[PDB]
Swiss-Prot record, chain A:
Netrins control guidance of CNS commissural axons and peripheral motor axons. Its association with either DCC or some UNC5 receptors will lead to axon attraction or repulsion, respectively. Binding to UNC5C might cause dissociation of UNC5C from polymerized TUBB3 in microtubules and thereby lead to increased microtubule dynamics and axon repulsion. Involved in dorsal root ganglion axon projection towards the spinal cord. It also serves as a survival factor via its association with its receptors which prevent the initiation of apoptosis. Involved in tumorigenesis by regulating apoptosis. Widely expressed in normal adult tissues with highest levels in heart, small intestine, colon, liver and prostate. Reduced expression in brain tumors and neuroblastomas. Expressed in epididymis (at protein level). This is Netrin-1. It is linked to Mirror movements 4: A disorder characterized by contralateral involuntary movements that mirror voluntary ones. While mirror movements are occasionally found in young children, persistence beyond the age of 10 is abnormal. Mirror movements occur more commonly in the upper extremities. MRMV4 inheritance is autosomal dominant. It is found in: Secreted; Cytoplasm. Binds to its receptors; DCC, UNC5A, UNC5B, UNC5C and probably UNC5D. Binds to its receptor; DSCAM. Interacts with DCC. Interacts with APP. The gene is NTN1. It comes from Homo sapiens (Human).
């Protein structure tokens, strides 16, 4: 998906007709499509599939890093399954967003 | 009156956040040819998909109760 401009993304959601995937990943682009940086990962085996720790808690040291979870990956519901990614979820300094340029850059995507 | 098409986008939307509630205010769409039965408020943290409250067409304001502090 190309927006063609810098947007401060709050969420990325997907409503499925078929069952939700066992492994899915959200990617963003700072430049207008040249290089890609991961945003969020969803898998049963975060280690084996996306080389990320399973159910990793959000670190204050790096909030600009994509995190992997087994949440929202369940086969049930086989229809109508939803995956909504909150960009500022769990991020420790999200409360003081206006003064945090680190998270201001994290929400940015073209 | 008119059920041949899907209702038009509403004209305005205004929120007012409190300690544990959010006062939502709105105005119906400009087009009257397409009949409107009501309004559907969709709220939640990060995404609006968390919960859905359906109200009648006469309603113009609604306060979303039982919410988290910050």
């Amino acid at each position: 998906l190309s927006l063609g401009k810098k947007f401060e993304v709050t969420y990325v959601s997907l409503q499925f007709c078929s069952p939700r995937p066992e492994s899915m990943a959200i990617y963003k682009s700072m430049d207008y499509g040249r290089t890609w940086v991961p945003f969020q990962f969803y898998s049963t085996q975060c280690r084996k599939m996306y080389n990320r720790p399973h159910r990793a808690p959000i670190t204050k040291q790096n909030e600009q890093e994509a995190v992997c979870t087994d949440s929202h990956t369940d086969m049930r519901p086989l229809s109508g399954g939803l995956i909504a990614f909150s960009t500022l979820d769990g991020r420790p300094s999200a409360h003081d967003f206006d003064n945090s340029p680190v998270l201001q850059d994290w929400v940015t995507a073209t | 009156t008119g059920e041949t098409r899907v209702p038009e986008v509403p004209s305005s939307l205004h929120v007012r956040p409190l300690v544990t509630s959010i006062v939502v205010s709105w105005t119906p769409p400009e087009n009257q040819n397409i009949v409107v039965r009501g309004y559907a408020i969709g709220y939640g943290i990060g995404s609006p998909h968390a919960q859905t409250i359906k109200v009648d067409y006469k309603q113009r304001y609604y306060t979303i109760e039982n919410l988290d502090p910050s």
